[PDB]
Structure formats: structure tokens, C-alpha cells
Amino acid sequence: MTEYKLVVVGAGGVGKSALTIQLIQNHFVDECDPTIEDSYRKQVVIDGETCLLDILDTAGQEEYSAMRDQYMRTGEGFLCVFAINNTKSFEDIHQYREQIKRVKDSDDVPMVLVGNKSDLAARTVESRQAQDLARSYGIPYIETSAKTRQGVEDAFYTLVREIRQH
Ligand SMILES: Nc1nc2c(ncn2[C@@H]2O[C@H](COP(=O)(O)OP(=O)(O)O)[C@@H](O)[C@H]2O)c(=O)[nH]1
Ligand SMILES: *CC(=O)N(C)CCN(C)c1ccc([N+](=O)[O-])c2nonc12
Ligand SMILES: [Mg+2]
């Protein structure tokens, strides 16, 4: 079956695992082992195509992992995630993208910028700010909540659409 290899990167606590697990298990986790990193597979129909998403949910851990290296190199699309109530997480984004540009040796990597925790009445990073970080990158911005699923399918499926047209 057609597959897409997706990688989810971003600062600690942005909700990378929560997003993954909403897409896959259709529920919210109120917390998660902050340190665990693996890939999960998920069947979805996207734009009418039956396919599998193989999603490495990264952790922040003191580098080297061969598995992590393998996904950073053969991964077709990256979700770059910050939380909209955490300005440091948003500032970090450029480190994550830059590491992806290095491992993929390209300025044109299927990516999507995700502002998670859109449910919160806690916003510190304004939407237009992220629109502009994304536009400058030439990639889409999408705001999500793992708590309510708003934007989640859209984050992932826009990423697939970016992998396809690459
Ligand atoms: N309100 C809210 N909390 C979230 C959301 N996503 C994650 N969280 C919380 O943020 C914390 C970090 O989540 P986690 O998935 O471990 O983040 P990770 O370190 O990026 O994998 C946990 O307490 C989650 O319950 C979200 O969309 N909304
Ligand atoms: C942060 C955390 O609680 N974990 C990494 C525990 C295991 N999780 C989140 C997990 C395990 C297995 C599968 N799976 O088989 O597909 C998951 N899919 O989303 N989260 C999964
Ligand atoms: Mg995690």
C-alpha cells in the first residue's frame, strides 16, 4: 500500500506526541512520556487515496539515534511544531527547520508549520507572526489542537499533499 513517511519535530512539550496520538488513536492524552521516540503507522484515506502514514514522533533526547537518523534522511515530509502559548517553542522552530534542510540537503523540503494548543485562551504567539514565518519559508501554516482535533487531520494531510507535489 502507498505510504508516506512523516516526521514530527519541535521543542519539548509543544504536543508532538499529542498530535500524533490524536491522528492515530483518535483521543487526547493529558500527558505523555516526554522522552519516548518511535514511529507509528496509520491507515487513512486522503483525497480519496487509501494509504499509510508512517510517523516518527521525535523526542528531544541527547543526540545520536540511528533510527532517528534514518527517518531524518528518508522522511518525505516534516511537521514543525510550536505551541501558540509558548514563545520559546516558536523561536526554536528555525533550529528544527535548519537541521531538516541539512539532513535533506535542500531548501525545498515538504514541511508544514503547526501552531498547536489552539484551544487555549493562553496565546502568546500571534497567528500572523506564524503566517509570516511560514510564508518566508514557502510552506503552509496550520493551527491545531490535540485536545479537540481542530486542524489535526488538516496538518497531516496538507503535509501529504506537499510530499506528493514535491
Ligand atoms: N490544551 C492543550 N494541551 C496540549 C495540547 N497538546 C499537548 N498538550 C499538553 O502539552 C503537554 C505536552 O504534550 P506532549 O504530547 O508530551 O508534547 P511533546 O513533548 O511535544 O511530545 C501535555 O501536558 C499535553 O497534555 C493541545 O493541543 N492543547
Ligand atoms: C508519550 C507516550 O505516552 N508514549 C510514547 C507511550 C506510547 N504511545 C504514545 C503510543 C504507543 C503505540 C502506538 N501505536 O501502536 O500506534 C501509538 N500511537 O500513538 N501513540 C502511541
Ligand atoms: Mg513526545
PDB file of C-alpha atoms and ligand atoms in Angstrom:
ATOM      1  CA  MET A   1       0.000   0.000   0.000  1.00  0.00           C
ATOM      2  CA  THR A   2       1.200   3.562  -0.727  1.00  0.00           C
ATOM      3  CA  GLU A   3       2.903   5.035   2.285  1.00  0.00           C
ATOM      4  CA  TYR A   4       4.114   8.464   3.345  1.00  0.00           C
ATOM      5  CA  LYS A   5       6.937   8.855   5.842  1.00  0.00           C
ATOM      6  CA  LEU A   6       6.215  11.852   8.105  1.00  0.00           C
ATOM      7  CA  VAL A   7       8.409  13.232  10.859  1.00  0.00           C
ATOM      8  CA  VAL A   8       7.161  15.408  13.736  1.00  0.00           C
ATOM      9  CA  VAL A   9       9.737  17.790  15.266  1.00  0.00           C
ATOM     10  CA  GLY A  10       9.620  20.713  17.724  1.00  0.00           C
ATOM     11  CA  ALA A  11      10.508  21.862  21.212  1.00  0.00           C
ATOM     12  CA  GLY A  12       9.763  19.806  24.259  1.00  0.00           C
ATOM     13  CA  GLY A  13       6.131  19.952  25.333  1.00  0.00           C
ATOM     14  CA  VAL A  14       4.675  21.518  22.196  1.00  0.00           C
ATOM     15  CA  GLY A  15       2.350  18.483  21.883  1.00  0.00           C
ATOM     16  CA  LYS A  16       4.114  16.409  19.180  1.00  0.00           C
ATOM     17  CA  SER A  17       3.055  13.195  20.801  1.00  0.00           C
ATOM     18  CA  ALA A  18      -0.437  14.520  21.472  1.00  0.00           C
ATOM     19  CA  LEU A  19      -0.854  15.377  17.794  1.00  0.00           C
ATOM     20  CA  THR A  20       0.465  12.002  16.684  1.00  0.00           C
ATOM     21  CA  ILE A  21      -1.828  10.169  19.065  1.00  0.00           C
ATOM     22  CA  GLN A  22      -4.891  12.174  18.028  1.00  0.00           C
ATOM     23  CA  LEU A  23      -4.236  11.376  14.402  1.00  0.00           C
ATOM     24  CA  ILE A  24      -3.701   7.708  15.258  1.00  0.00           C
ATOM     25  CA  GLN A  25      -5.724   6.822  18.351  1.00  0.00           C
ATOM     26  CA  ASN A  26      -8.456   9.498  17.942  1.00  0.00           C
ATOM     27  CA  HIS A  27      -8.119  10.660  21.548  1.00  0.00           C
ATOM     28  CA  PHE A  28      -6.221  13.189  23.668  1.00  0.00           C
ATOM     29  CA  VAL A  29      -3.581  12.261  26.177  1.00  0.00           C
ATOM     30  CA  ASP A  30      -3.396  14.688  29.126  1.00  0.00           C
ATOM     31  CA  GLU A  31       0.307  13.843  29.269  1.00  0.00           C
ATOM     32  CA  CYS A  32       2.971  11.555  27.839  1.00  0.00           C
ATOM     33  CA  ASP A  33       6.448  10.203  28.404  1.00  0.00           C
ATOM     34  CA  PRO A  34       8.430  13.300  27.281  1.00  0.00           C
ATOM     35  CA  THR A  35      11.404  11.166  26.345  1.00  0.00           C
ATOM     36  CA  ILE A  36       9.989   8.413  24.116  1.00  0.00           C
ATOM     37  CA  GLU A  37      10.575   8.435  20.331  1.00  0.00           C
ATOM     38  CA  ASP A  38       9.210   5.951  17.809  1.00  0.00           C
ATOM     39  CA  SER A  39       7.364   5.557  14.546  1.00  0.00           C
ATOM     40  CA  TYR A  40       3.734   4.579  14.270  1.00  0.00           C
ATOM     41  CA  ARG A  41       1.729   3.594  11.330  1.00  0.00           C
ATOM     42  CA  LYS A  42      -1.757   4.743  10.493  1.00  0.00           C
ATOM     43  CA  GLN A  43      -4.155   3.972   7.663  1.00  0.00           C
ATOM     44  CA  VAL A  44      -6.090   6.948   6.353  1.00  0.00           C
ATOM     45  CA  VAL A  45      -7.904   7.841   3.102  1.00  0.00           C
ATOM     46  CA  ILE A  46      -6.576  11.189   1.866  1.00  0.00           C
ATOM     47  CA  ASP A  47      -8.055  12.931  -1.097  1.00  0.00           C
ATOM     48  CA  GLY A  48      -9.581   9.506  -1.855  1.00  0.00           C
ATOM     49  CA  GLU A  49      -6.347   7.566  -1.779  1.00  0.00           C
ATOM     50  CA  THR A  50      -6.098   4.692   0.692  1.00  0.00           C
ATOM     51  CA  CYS A  51      -2.622   4.881   2.198  1.00  0.00           C
ATOM     52  CA  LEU A  52      -0.474   4.504   5.342  1.00  0.00           C
ATOM     53  CA  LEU A  53       1.231   7.292   7.261  1.00  0.00           C
ATOM     54  CA  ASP A  54       4.467   6.150   8.982  1.00  0.00           C
ATOM     55  CA  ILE A  55       5.018   8.896  11.563  1.00  0.00           C
ATOM     56  CA  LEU A  56       8.175   9.256  13.629  1.00  0.00           C
ATOM     57  CA  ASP A  57       7.285  11.217  16.728  1.00  0.00           C
ATOM     58  CA  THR A  58      10.626  12.665  17.792  1.00  0.00           C
ATOM     59  CA  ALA A  59      11.933  13.310  21.242  1.00  0.00           C
ATOM     60  CA  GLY A  60      14.460  15.894  22.331  1.00  0.00           C
ATOM     61  CA  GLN A  61      16.982  13.468  23.615  1.00  0.00           C
ATOM     62  CA  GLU A  62      20.765  13.853  23.704  1.00  0.00           C
ATOM     63  CA  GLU A  63      21.560  13.025  20.164  1.00  0.00           C
ATOM     64  CA  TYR A  64      22.575  10.027  18.415  1.00  0.00           C
ATOM     65  CA  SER A  65      19.917   7.564  17.364  1.00  0.00           C
ATOM     66  CA  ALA A  66      20.357   5.544  14.170  1.00  0.00           C
ATOM     67  CA  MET A  67      16.618   5.191  13.767  1.00  0.00           C
ATOM     68  CA  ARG A  68      16.188   8.932  14.159  1.00  0.00           C
ATOM     69  CA  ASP A  69      18.941   9.474  11.553  1.00  0.00           C
ATOM     70  CA  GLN A  70      17.224   7.075   9.128  1.00  0.00           C
ATOM     71  CA  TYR A  71      13.894   8.978   9.339  1.00  0.00           C
ATOM     72  CA  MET A  72      15.506  12.406   9.152  1.00  0.00           C
ATOM     73  CA  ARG A  73      17.172  11.208   5.861  1.00  0.00           C
ATOM     74  CA  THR A  74      14.421   9.143   4.166  1.00  0.00           C
ATOM     75  CA  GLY A  75      11.489  11.088   5.599  1.00  0.00           C
ATOM     76  CA  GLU A  76       9.348  12.659   2.923  1.00  0.00           C
ATOM     77  CA  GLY A  77       7.637  15.378   4.969  1.00  0.00           C
ATOM     78  CA  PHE A  78       8.154  17.177   8.312  1.00  0.00           C
ATOM     79  CA  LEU A  79       5.671  18.715  10.750  1.00  0.00           C
ATOM     80  CA  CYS A  80       7.460  21.544  12.554  1.00  0.00           C
ATOM     81  CA  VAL A  81       5.541  22.256  15.704  1.00  0.00           C
ATOM     82  CA  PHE A  82       5.452  25.054  18.225  1.00  0.00           C
ATOM     83  CA  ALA A  83       2.824  25.788  20.890  1.00  0.00           C
ATOM     84  CA  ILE A  84       0.943  29.048  20.439  1.00  0.00           C
ATOM     85  CA  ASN A  85       1.160  29.747  24.231  1.00  0.00           C
ATOM     86  CA  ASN A  86       4.950  29.319  24.345  1.00  0.00           C
ATOM     87  CA  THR A  87       7.153  31.917  22.657  1.00  0.00           C
ATOM     88  CA  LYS A  88      10.387  29.969  23.210  1.00  0.00           C
ATOM     89  CA  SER A  89       8.959  26.998  21.323  1.00  0.00           C
ATOM     90  CA  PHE A  90       8.209  29.300  18.343  1.00  0.00           C
ATOM     91  CA  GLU A  91      11.716  30.841  18.448  1.00  0.00           C
ATOM     92  CA  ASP A  92      13.139  27.284  18.342  1.00  0.00           C
ATOM     93  CA  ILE A  93      11.448  26.478  15.066  1.00  0.00           C
ATOM     94  CA  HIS A  94      14.287  27.791  12.913  1.00  0.00           C
ATOM     95  CA  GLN A  95      16.717  25.322  14.574  1.00  0.00           C
ATOM     96  CA  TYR A  96      14.483  22.404  13.644  1.00  0.00           C
ATOM     97  CA  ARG A  97      13.928  23.512  10.079  1.00  0.00           C
ATOM     98  CA  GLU A  98      17.653  24.245   9.592  1.00  0.00           C
ATOM     99  CA  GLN A  99      18.514  20.746  10.793  1.00  0.00           C
ATOM    100  CA  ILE A 100      15.966  19.353   8.357  1.00  0.00           C
ATOM    101  CA  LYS A 101      17.388  21.449   5.495  1.00  0.00           C
ATOM    102  CA  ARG A 102      20.828  19.988   6.355  1.00  0.00           C
ATOM    103  CA  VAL A 103      19.753  16.331   6.504  1.00  0.00           C
ATOM    104  CA  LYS A 104      17.688  16.640   3.315  1.00  0.00           C
ATOM    105  CA  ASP A 105      20.313  18.904   1.624  1.00  0.00           C
ATOM    106  CA  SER A 106      17.551  21.136   0.337  1.00  0.00           C
ATOM    107  CA  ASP A 107      15.732  24.419   0.875  1.00  0.00           C
ATOM    108  CA  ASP A 108      12.633  22.770  -0.576  1.00  0.00           C
ATOM    109  CA  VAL A 109      11.530  20.081   1.853  1.00  0.00           C
ATOM    110  CA  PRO A 110       7.895  19.171   2.214  1.00  0.00           C
ATOM    111  CA  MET A 111       7.104  20.843   5.503  1.00  0.00           C
ATOM    112  CA  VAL A 112       4.234  22.350   7.378  1.00  0.00           C
ATOM    113  CA  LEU A 113       4.403  24.754  10.290  1.00  0.00           C
ATOM    114  CA  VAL A 114       1.989  23.793  13.091  1.00  0.00           C
ATOM    115  CA  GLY A 115       0.852  26.055  15.926  1.00  0.00           C
ATOM    116  CA  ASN A 116      -0.592  23.693  18.483  1.00  0.00           C
ATOM    117  CA  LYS A 117      -2.869  24.236  21.515  1.00  0.00           C
ATOM    118  CA  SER A 118      -5.260  26.435  19.605  1.00  0.00           C
ATOM    119  CA  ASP A 119      -7.879  25.592  22.255  1.00  0.00           C
ATOM    120  CA  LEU A 120      -6.054  27.632  24.901  1.00  0.00           C
ATOM    121  CA  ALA A 121      -7.038  31.056  25.977  1.00  0.00           C
ATOM    122  CA  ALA A 122      -3.270  31.431  26.541  1.00  0.00           C
ATOM    123  CA  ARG A 123      -1.911  32.679  23.204  1.00  0.00           C
ATOM    124  CA  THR A 124       1.440  34.386  23.197  1.00  0.00           C
ATOM    125  CA  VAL A 125       2.458  33.759  19.560  1.00  0.00           C
ATOM    126  CA  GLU A 126       0.143  35.567  17.196  1.00  0.00           C
ATOM    127  CA  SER A 127      -1.200  33.830  14.111  1.00  0.00           C
ATOM    128  CA  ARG A 128       0.008  36.412  11.679  1.00  0.00           C
ATOM    129  CA  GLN A 129       3.536  36.006  13.134  1.00  0.00           C
ATOM    130  CA  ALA A 130       3.470  32.321  12.215  1.00  0.00           C
ATOM    131  CA  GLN A 131       1.817  33.006   8.910  1.00  0.00           C
ATOM    132  CA  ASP A 132       4.866  35.204   8.185  1.00  0.00           C
ATOM    133  CA  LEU A 133       7.499  32.741   9.441  1.00  0.00           C
ATOM    134  CA  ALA A 134       5.843  30.116   7.235  1.00  0.00           C
ATOM    135  CA  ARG A 135       5.385  32.379   4.075  1.00  0.00           C
ATOM    136  CA  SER A 136       9.025  33.346   4.238  1.00  0.00           C
ATOM    137  CA  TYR A 137       9.754  29.586   4.247  1.00  0.00           C
ATOM    138  CA  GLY A 138       7.303  28.980   1.386  1.00  0.00           C
ATOM    139  CA  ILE A 139       5.335  26.453   3.447  1.00  0.00           C
ATOM    140  CA  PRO A 140       1.840  26.263   4.875  1.00  0.00           C
ATOM    141  CA  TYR A 141       0.839  27.233   8.388  1.00  0.00           C
ATOM    142  CA  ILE A 142      -1.897  25.354  10.241  1.00  0.00           C
ATOM    143  CA  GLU A 143      -3.178  25.854  13.776  1.00  0.00           C
ATOM    144  CA  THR A 144      -4.192  22.744  15.716  1.00  0.00           C
ATOM    145  CA  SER A 145      -5.451  21.456  18.992  1.00  0.00           C
ATOM    146  CA  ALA A 146      -4.670  17.887  20.104  1.00  0.00           C
ATOM    147  CA  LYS A 147      -7.337  18.382  22.756  1.00  0.00           C
ATOM    148  CA  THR A 148     -10.182  18.974  20.318  1.00  0.00           C
ATOM    149  CA  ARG A 149      -8.736  17.673  16.987  1.00  0.00           C
ATOM    150  CA  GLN A 150      -9.247  21.050  15.341  1.00  0.00           C
ATOM    151  CA  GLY A 151      -6.810  21.366  12.405  1.00  0.00           C
ATOM    152  CA  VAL A 152      -5.139  17.987  13.044  1.00  0.00           C
ATOM    153  CA  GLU A 153      -6.148  15.944  10.039  1.00  0.00           C
ATOM    154  CA  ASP A 154      -5.502  19.200   8.091  1.00  0.00           C
ATOM    155  CA  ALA A 155      -1.909  19.472   9.379  1.00  0.00           C
ATOM    156  CA  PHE A 156      -1.085  15.945   8.391  1.00  0.00           C
ATOM    157  CA  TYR A 157      -2.970  15.821   5.139  1.00  0.00           C
ATOM    158  CA  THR A 158      -1.630  19.163   3.902  1.00  0.00           C
ATOM    159  CA  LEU A 159       1.827  17.669   4.562  1.00  0.00           C
ATOM    160  CA  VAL A 160       0.963  14.646   2.372  1.00  0.00           C
ATOM    161  CA  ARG A 161      -0.211  16.999  -0.344  1.00  0.00           C
ATOM    162  CA  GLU A 162       3.141  18.767  -0.098  1.00  0.00           C
ATOM    163  CA  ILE A 163       5.045  15.440  -0.335  1.00  0.00           C
ATOM    164  CA  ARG A 164       3.038  14.435  -3.394  1.00  0.00           C
ATOM    165  CA  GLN A 165       3.623  17.645  -5.398  1.00  0.00           C
ATOM    166  CA  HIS A 166       7.242  17.977  -4.408  1.00  0.00           C
TER     167      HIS A 166
HETATM  168  N1  LIG B   1      -4.526  22.292  25.952  1.00  0.00           N
HETATM  169  C1  LIG B   1      -3.694  21.538  25.193  1.00  0.00           C
HETATM  170  N2  LIG B   1      -2.699  20.872  25.799  1.00  0.00           N
HETATM  171  C2  LIG B   1      -1.907  20.126  24.975  1.00  0.00           C
HETATM  172  C3  LIG B   1      -2.055  20.046  23.540  1.00  0.00           C
HETATM  173  N3  LIG B   1      -1.082  19.242  23.029  1.00  0.00           N
HETATM  174  C4  LIG B   1      -0.361  18.827  24.067  1.00  0.00           C
HETATM  175  N4  LIG B   1      -0.861  19.362  25.202  1.00  0.00           N
HETATM  176  C5  LIG B   1      -0.291  19.163  26.519  1.00  0.00           C
HETATM  177  O1  LIG B   1       1.056  19.600  26.398  1.00  0.00           O
HETATM  178  C6  LIG B   1       1.882  18.742  27.187  1.00  0.00           C
HETATM  179  C7  LIG B   1       2.960  18.158  26.284  1.00  0.00           C
HETATM  180  O2  LIG B   1       2.356  17.232  25.393  1.00  0.00           O
HETATM  181  P1  LIG B   1       3.244  16.151  24.629  1.00  0.00           P
HETATM  182  O3  LIG B   1       2.389  15.467  23.641  1.00  0.00           O
HETATM  183  O4  LIG B   1       4.055  15.346  25.656  1.00  0.00           O
HETATM  184  O5  LIG B   1       4.331  17.074  23.906  1.00  0.00           O
HETATM  185  P2  LIG B   1       5.726  16.612  23.222  1.00  0.00           P
HETATM  186  O6  LIG B   1       6.813  16.754  24.284  1.00  0.00           O
HETATM  187  O7  LIG B   1       5.884  17.588  22.062  1.00  0.00           O
HETATM  188  O8  LIG B   1       5.530  15.182  22.765  1.00  0.00           O
HETATM  189  C8  LIG B   1       0.952  17.711  27.830  1.00  0.00           C
HETATM  190  O9  LIG B   1       0.521  18.107  29.123  1.00  0.00           O
HETATM  191  C9  LIG B   1      -0.257  17.712  26.926  1.00  0.00           C
HETATM  192  O10 LIG B   1      -1.465  17.301  27.560  1.00  0.00           O
HETATM  193  C10 LIG B   1      -3.129  20.818  22.966  1.00  0.00           C
HETATM  194  O11 LIG B   1      -3.361  20.852  21.742  1.00  0.00           O
HETATM  195  N5  LIG B   1      -3.883  21.522  23.853  1.00  0.00           N
HETATM  196  C1  LIG B   2       4.412   9.705  25.233  1.00  0.00           C
HETATM  197  C2  LIG B   2       3.819   8.334  25.470  1.00  0.00           C
HETATM  198  O1  LIG B   2       2.965   8.263  26.343  1.00  0.00           O
HETATM  199  N1  LIG B   2       4.165   7.255  24.743  1.00  0.00           N
HETATM  200  C3  LIG B   2       5.173   7.224  23.673  1.00  0.00           C
HETATM  201  C4  LIG B   2       3.503   5.977  25.043  1.00  0.00           C
HETATM  202  C5  LIG B   2       3.136   5.147  23.802  1.00  0.00           C
HETATM  203  N2  LIG B   2       2.371   5.818  22.724  1.00  0.00           N
HETATM  204  C6  LIG B   2       2.020   7.240  22.778  1.00  0.00           C
HETATM  205  C7  LIG B   2       1.977   5.070  21.623  1.00  0.00           C
HETATM  206  C8  LIG B   2       2.292   3.703  21.547  1.00  0.00           C
HETATM  207  C9  LIG B   2       1.911   2.925  20.460  1.00  0.00           C
HETATM  208  C10 LIG B   2       1.201   3.484  19.402  1.00  0.00           C
HETATM  209  N3  LIG B   2       0.810   2.697  18.299  1.00  0.00           N
HETATM  210  O2  LIG B   2       0.863   1.475  18.337  1.00  0.00           O
HETATM  211  O3  LIG B   2       0.400   3.232  17.284  1.00  0.00           O
HETATM  212  C11 LIG B   2       0.865   4.838  19.441  1.00  0.00           C
HETATM  213  N4  LIG B   2       0.184   5.580  18.527  1.00  0.00           N
HETATM  214  O4  LIG B   2       0.147   6.883  19.081  1.00  0.00           O
HETATM  215  N5  LIG B   2       0.813   6.902  20.338  1.00  0.00           N
HETATM  216  C12 LIG B   2       1.255   5.635  20.548  1.00  0.00           C
HETATM  217 MG    MG B   3       6.583  13.478  22.987  1.00  0.00          MG
END
